[PDB]
Amino acid sequence: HIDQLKEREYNNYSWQDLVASGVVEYIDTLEEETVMLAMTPDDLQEKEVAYCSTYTHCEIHPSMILGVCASIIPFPDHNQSPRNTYQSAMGKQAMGVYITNFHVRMDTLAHVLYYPQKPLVTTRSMEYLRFRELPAGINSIVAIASYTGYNQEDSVIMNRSAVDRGFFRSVFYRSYKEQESKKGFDQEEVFEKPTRETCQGMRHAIYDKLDDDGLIAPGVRVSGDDVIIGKTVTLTKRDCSTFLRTSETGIVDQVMVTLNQEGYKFCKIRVRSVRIPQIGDKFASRHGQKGTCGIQYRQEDMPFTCEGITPDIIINPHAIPSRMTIGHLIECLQGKVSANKGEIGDATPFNDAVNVQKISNLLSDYGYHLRGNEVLYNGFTGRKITSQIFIGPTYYQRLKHMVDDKIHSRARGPIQILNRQPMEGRSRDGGLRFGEMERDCQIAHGAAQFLRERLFEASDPYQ
Amino acid sequence: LNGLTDRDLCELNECPLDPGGYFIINGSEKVLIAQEKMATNTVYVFAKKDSKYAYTGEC
Amino acid sequence: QARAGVSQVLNRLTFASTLSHLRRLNSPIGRDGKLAKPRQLHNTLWGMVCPAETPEGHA
Amino acid sequence: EWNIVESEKALVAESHNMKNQQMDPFTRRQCK
């Protein structure tokens, strides 16, 4: 069977052949309770203390228990379950090439990474998950240490020169949908530049940026509160046109115009934005070591090994013991080995042939400490570091939680219509909520004046 | 796209890697989450204590 | 009066997310229930449901 | 194809070098 199947894709042999031959069999959860399952064929059947010696079935491979997001975790069994679950949930938030034909899609909120490299250590299971063709991270030279201090409570230090060279540099698209319709017998919308004379309702923004057709041309600079579509509705006309959301500051990629089912002019426009990795961006490894970039140093400042290899990320050492993510360290070591040798390594969950000692022995055959530690130098002064830092390649991701999409502020913004209080939401330009717990805290402080200011003066003065 | 070659898929502004199996309503990818429930036509004997019955044969 | 969330928007933020979303389940039990038996990873979920992947919020 | 042959040669070599296996970092369950 193994031979006839290894010669598949050439003749015709497939899974159905095995199922028909009677070598595999589908067992459902309700039947699984009455079969003496066995993990591996060889190990659990040779001859030993008579445990059961009546096995009926035998699992294909234990790691196959894992799911989709979990499988991409290398060495999952070397980590505490909560961190595995955190990685599983975070993987879905990783950026990268989400689909090959992305330049044709007009979806909303699409991120794409420039150089989505492939993991230096891939599990045998992801070969079918298709991860290697559409990766979601870059292999960075991570050095676990506390260089300066800006990476102490679950934070990292990235390399400014790396970012300059295009390290984790991604792009952010934002699509827009807008079409004309017959509002009423007298009401009617139409694309046309709202001039300063005929249109009564109008915004205090630039309109000549777009062409006469009313659709901003591709490859044009835009900023917050700028007109993107020149929609005007006749009452003489009211400027019922949409504007780019505040704090977007993008460039128009392409403009699509067509007819919807109703037959009216329906147009979509997407704006791209080159998001340079800056501090406050959230990163995460494949082991649940989330974090936010604290500060960025230039290559001249980052530390360096006996040769010019400066780390690209520096996580806090203290994140390791409490969380028990030894899998991350194993990944780093095997990644160093894989880089030196020149081929991708294996990290299948249960392999029985991948221990730390053998990996260390291999690594020792390239002039590196068998445990992966190396001697760095203080980037500032150039004095060796007494402690031998632990530096090696490791696969890191980038989540979409950019800082610029969360930063917000307010100073007497728009007010609601029902209760004259500030709006809610960053997009609507609202103010934060001063919750009952905050009220209680202020009462405890006894700052009655401050409490009354927050609740009356800057909330909704009225007489 | 039933059993259609990657050539045609590429020419139709689609990729062969898309898993598929998701509807398109109003130009939005809608996916049906697989709900779960109790198997039908099977007798269950629960022992609810917060009630007047010692045992309940639900079916 | 009917259920909610049965049909969701396919999260096309990355291929892994697409696969996970296309292969997801959802229990009909009320959100944020006081009980804790249905949430716990039951033994029978061996090789059927990933024991690691799951949200970490109220659900 | 080269990877497949590499894996097969690695497997046969692992089978061949069956002299001794004394390693600290590895273990397996043994019930009863």
Binding site: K6, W15 | - | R23 | -
Partner: peptide
């Protein structure tokens, strides 16, 4: 003939065949 020891490689050929014949979303 049984496949002793030399089974790590042969264990994944069946998996590859399965994932080739049936896709990830085959149930839907």
């Amino acid at each position: 003939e049984i496949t002793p020891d030399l089974w790590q490689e042969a264990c994944w050929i069946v998996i590859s065949s399965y994932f080739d014949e049936k896709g990830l979303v085959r149930q839907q």
